[PDB]
Amino acid sequence: KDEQFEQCVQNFNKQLTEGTRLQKDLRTYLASVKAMHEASKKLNECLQEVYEPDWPGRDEANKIAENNDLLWMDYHQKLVDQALLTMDTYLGQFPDIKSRIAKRGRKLVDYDSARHHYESLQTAKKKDEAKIAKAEEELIKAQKVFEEMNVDLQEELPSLWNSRVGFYVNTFQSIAGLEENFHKEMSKLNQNLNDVLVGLE
Template sequence: MQNLGKADKTTDEIFEDHLLNFNTQQVNATRLHKDINNYLRCIRAMQTANKNLMDTLSEIYEKEWVGQDMLYVQAQNNEMLWADLAHKLADQVVTPLNTYQAQFPEMRKKIDKRGRKLIDFDAERHTVQQMQNNPNRNEAKFIRAKEQMENAKRTYEVLNSELHDELPALYDSRILFLVTNMQTLFAAEEVFHSETSKVYSELEAVVDKLAKEVQKGTLPRRAYNRPLPIANHSAPVIQNSSSMNSPPKATNGGSHKYRGNSPTKDYEMVGMDRDDNYHSSSHVEYNGNGNGNRISRGQYDIPSGKENQHPDEGRIGGLGGSTSIGATTDNLPPGVLYKVKAAYKYQAEDVDELNFEVGEIIQVVEYEDPEEQQEEGWLMGVKESTGQKGLFPANFSRPI
């Protein structure tokens, strides 16, 4: 009837303004609560991600490097700062916000109750007005209707009066709450970023020291013995468990070049008879520098005590047309004797030598110059990756 204009409606413009402010305040509080909680979840996610990152850096930062202890200490400090920030936000920002927001549902219930009591008062007032305009009214009912109207009016006015005081007070409280809440948030962030900047400054200093040591070449390195090539004239050496841990060393400091001659000696050239036994066939000239024998292509120097050894036993690498033990000769390109795989990294020390990394494949080929073919323990090869050709120590590789 009020909506159709058939009944009077009690209006209160001041209350309507208070109600509009209340609705705006509640919407803003709900939005702030949602975003603060989401922010805290992100802080905790970053806390976990940062801890994982620092743990990984601490584990892969080698003990020999400068500042390894400092890196671990600063990683622990950083973890504590993240945990402290998350705790402060949860305890001093989110908890007060939950208390602040909890006021709105209770106030909403009171506002709704005031609206119902206003409708009751307007209905009783409309009934009294109708009975008052009726000359044939029942006086007893009219008196009872007036009493009910007064009761409804008192109930409504009590609630309305309370809300006229409480709504403005609640609306004004938003300022002090936001000031306190935001001060706590910003102060916690300021402390966190100030302290973390110190942590990262220390970490940067650690890395700078490491970089300077690398540039100066003063960084401690693990010592590795360089591998020695196995001379073609000698039998393979069976190494024990301790000697297998060190890589071989190259003869003559890693170079295949000779630096002088030793006294000339004569050795018998040996061949194979029908019973696969060695027999003398000729003499070869031995010219060396004390590090091994220098042997012509197709000739073999048989070490003492190996006279009954098969010619292919103990020969690592090849000279001329010979083939390394365990190497396959199937499906090879023309001119390739066999293939080897680099077991160690080798840095060339002469222009006619090969550089290679561990794992590179090298094709062993014939020597072009018969004089070069006399270099003991060295092979002529072509790197498959680049096509570069040169000499390399045989025992830096393994036959394929």
């Protein structure tokens, strides 16, 4: 039951470790998207550079390069708003639970100390009733302090653990939903450029 609680603690550290990695990979994916965007803009700038203003389709190829720019921007901004910054509430939960767990640990040590002291007094050599009285009071106090920390963690850790499912499912549904749409809209731009370039064949 130390054991029951230590399992919650081990689940909590795993949940914390996995949720940290998922964001970092999200962050890295985000930075990829931005660099793919910048590279695509330079590549389109090469086409614009050679495409003369009077050649048929020039203005339209331009329109398409600007739509491409906008599409990458919107994908990246939506990923940020809908998948990355939507994690805030959930991860925000962790720091203070971690802290409360280490504090529960110290209050348990304090409680164990006060038990040990109370115990040393019960095996005199005539009992010193007054010292017993104070040690008993310190024991009961340190037990209450420990037991409050303990009771709130015991309901809170299973609740958090269970919510990890929702978090993962929702984050990946937002990313996959956004991604389906981006790639759909993309392909249309590729098609539009292709039809313009058919004119110069």
